[PDB]
Design a protein around this nucleic acid. Sequence first.
DNA 1: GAGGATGACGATG
DNA 2: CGCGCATCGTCATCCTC
DNA 3: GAGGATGACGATG
Lengths: 664, 83, 264, 53
Amino acid sequence: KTLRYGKIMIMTDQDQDGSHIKGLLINFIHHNWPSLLRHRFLEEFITPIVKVSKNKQEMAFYSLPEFEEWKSSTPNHKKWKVKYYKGLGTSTSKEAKEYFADMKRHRIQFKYSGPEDDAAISLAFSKKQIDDRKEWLTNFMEDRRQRKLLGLPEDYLYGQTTTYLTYNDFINKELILFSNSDNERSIPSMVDGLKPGQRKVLFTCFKRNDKREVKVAQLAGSVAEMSSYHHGEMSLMMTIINLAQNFVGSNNLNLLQPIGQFGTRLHGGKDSASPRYIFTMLSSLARLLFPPKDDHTLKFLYDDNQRVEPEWYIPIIPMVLINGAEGIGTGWSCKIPNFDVREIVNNIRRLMDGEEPLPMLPSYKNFKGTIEELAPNQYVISGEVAILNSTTIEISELPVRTWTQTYKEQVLEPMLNGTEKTPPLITDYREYHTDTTVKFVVKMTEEKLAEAERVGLHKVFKLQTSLTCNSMVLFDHVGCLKKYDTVLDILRDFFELRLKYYGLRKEWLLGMLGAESAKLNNQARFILEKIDGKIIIENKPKKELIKVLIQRGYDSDPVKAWKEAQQKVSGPTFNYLLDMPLWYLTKEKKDELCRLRNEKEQELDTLKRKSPSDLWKEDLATFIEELEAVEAKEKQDEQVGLPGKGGKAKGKKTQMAEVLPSPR
Amino acid sequence: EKIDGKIIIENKPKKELIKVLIQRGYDSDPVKAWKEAQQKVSGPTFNYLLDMPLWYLTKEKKDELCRLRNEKEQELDTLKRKS
Amino acid sequence: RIQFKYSGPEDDAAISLAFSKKQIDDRKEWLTNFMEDRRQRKLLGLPEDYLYGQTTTYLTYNDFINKELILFSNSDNERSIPSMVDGLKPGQRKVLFTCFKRNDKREVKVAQLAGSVAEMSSYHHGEMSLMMTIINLAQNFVGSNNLNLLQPIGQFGTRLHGGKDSASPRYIFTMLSSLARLLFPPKDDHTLKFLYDDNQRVEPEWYIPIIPMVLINGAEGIGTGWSCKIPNFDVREIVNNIRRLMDGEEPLPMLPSYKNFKGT
Amino acid sequence: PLITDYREYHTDTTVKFVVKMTEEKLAEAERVGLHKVFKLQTSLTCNSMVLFD
DNA sequence: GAGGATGACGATG
DNA sequence: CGCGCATCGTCATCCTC
DNA sequence: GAGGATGACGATG
């Protein structure tokens, strides 16, 4: 009674986001006041997610499995007018009046019995129960896989009216969906290495041509309109900005072109302007990375009866090894550094040959720093320093994760003045930083330089960086998570998954060329028959024309046949034989068609002659030519970024060999 | 004219075809003329006389065109008659 | 980096000219003189004068007031009050032209439409003003408008609290109305001459509606030198008045009317 | 205090006012004017008829 | 009973 | 992603010595 | 000299 309130009612949407807020609130309350979980202190308010209406008849549905059961149990499909309720802006005051007209349906309390539930309350909030959560997610994934294989429908809540709600089912049924969704959206798969947001953006970009430039804010709305994006607008724009970043230490191959200020390498890289201030344009590499002919390979999802993006893609190279996968999710995580793009082609060629591929080293574009690996899955990265004189010194190259403002505030300020425990190390410093390169006119006492050398230049200035790669967990082609050991095994798995598709593409291409080939052959035969002359065009009925076309061995539309054999794999159709203008009756058109019909025959004979092998190399040849062109453009940009200043002076430089602490 | 039959379609060069189209009183594209007389207000064009599919050679298409050509004449006469 | 120059107290009068509540007629004469000079220069084809042609060390206040701020005054006056021919402001004009560019059979988002309008109409006034203009075009409740060009989809603000309590432009949806097809027939596209900016076909300077919009939705414009405030009227009487005028008789006096309003 | 009670049963478009008042004060309100006391009158003038030709 | 003071306002910064 | 100060000018109230 | 405490982080609320 002393408290200002007696009951706490929280309300969220039917999405999984509210589950996290409810869990955090339960944690905040139970952490200090467990005894208040038995006096009707907490309750819940719920909202609808979808409503059907036909002939002034409405039905309420609060669960997606409930909607699936309603579809499986009712013979009316498309008969009911459906209306989705993703957010709060859709509902109106007239609906709120009906919502508050029935309290016993939405206002539901909770129930607590036995201390065992508290363990579950701690399960999602204990830093010492990581393996327990791992087993929990594994059990749920196995159960979902088994239920999907057996085709048995899963269980859901809010089927009928309820007065209370047990915590055990609350944790085991609702928050687990948020955990699964966060894990699915946080870490990309191993097949394409693209997150769902990047996937939606790239699919929307593929939908159009975009010959000219386009705004980011304008593109975000178009992406959200077709990709069914329901996560606000800021996250999508942030993902687009991350895709746009291509500076040193961020990415190695982007899908866009840098137009505007996308954040510099000086202050965090997050100092970019508004998405409407900046412009963007699609790159030329995406055309070769994802060939259009692969659209008939994967099966798209069916949401809102709309053709949407697929679940993954089939790139020519694993993107995780070129741009890095930094994902943080529940149960596991993923952090893979970058590598060299040139070595990937040589490794793939060696694997196609059948030889053991050479070990790779983490590389970065525009980075001259050497990396030595002493222990497996561990790397040491150091920069380069130049000693011009016994007093002056300059840092030539900085290691990865080195920002100008942070490095300055964390190194120069303690070294310049005398701190509480350390004397002033440096005497002077200058920052002549360019757009990409750095300059340090730093002076130091000659006597202190000997001590700095004895201790270590990389050690005193903190130029060494250690990283370990152990979380090699990625989504498999099936959907499972497996902790990997080496990169070469991932390359071999990708190679097998890619080899599986050469035959599929060959089967799709074979016969499809034959269809247009037979179509052109029939058209040429019709032209030759007209030159000879048997079909009278004197106002003859279409029925006699179709009868003659059937009696003279003319097939129907092959394109219609290939279209019919796509969803699951009157009478005849002859529109294509009558939709031809009179230009076909000219000598030049006939002469060019006589060889156009054989231009396809040449490729068809080549496909019948070629093997599934020797195609990957021919596909990579154009890609290597385009990559050399892109590198030439990058060198041209460097020439643009050339002010006219003198080259860096040659000077003594050394790399420290840290003792190996034998970690892990 | 095709029903009567004088223009041979046996791989004749386009030059002879254009010469025949000029000699038989066939004008150029009127849409091109109205487009030209819009900004400030090779030789002849006959693409529209050759971009027609074979469906025009059917009885039903000819019968419907015979009245479609007069559907516009009715509105043209009405415009010439109305104020 | 250019400094300024001050000579003589007379410039202070100009400094007060654009900032005196007792010199309204003086500003009116000033705008009138500028408009007459611009009309004469355009008719004679003589090029006007401009500043910053060569390097300058100082800048006199008299020319500063008479040459630079006057352009802002003219632009604000041109963009604030609509014309008498169509009664549409330049923002509404750009939005309606962009809407005419497409068909829009289904619904569309407001925030998504604003970018498409800004992309083709050469809009350079941020994004908030365009969305606010779209919201004002969307309002159709009692006491606001009598005939809109859109359809009410969502919460466009109620008649209880200011009418400005609407949600985010992305929260709400919109759809083109069916009356616009009859108000602006497509065949009128060959009548007006469009401007040529960026070598691109853009919206015209005005439109030719079947009825004066100022008498159906009101023109509330506040600009420099003058303003405009016209109340609403009845739509049924407009047709009778136009028929009587086509006949050649003296039209009857009208009375300000409002949709769903029984007040005399 | 002029009024004694009031209620606001407002719909989406229409309004409702269950308002009570002293019968004696109603006579004074009538003598003064219902539109005047409750401020229901609104005056507007249209003089700025300036438009772009 | 009249004049200075207070908001109504609609596109833009 | 909601939070908030103003401009140009015109006019309806409105209240006190 | 080792273990708890402090930030690095990337999509979303």
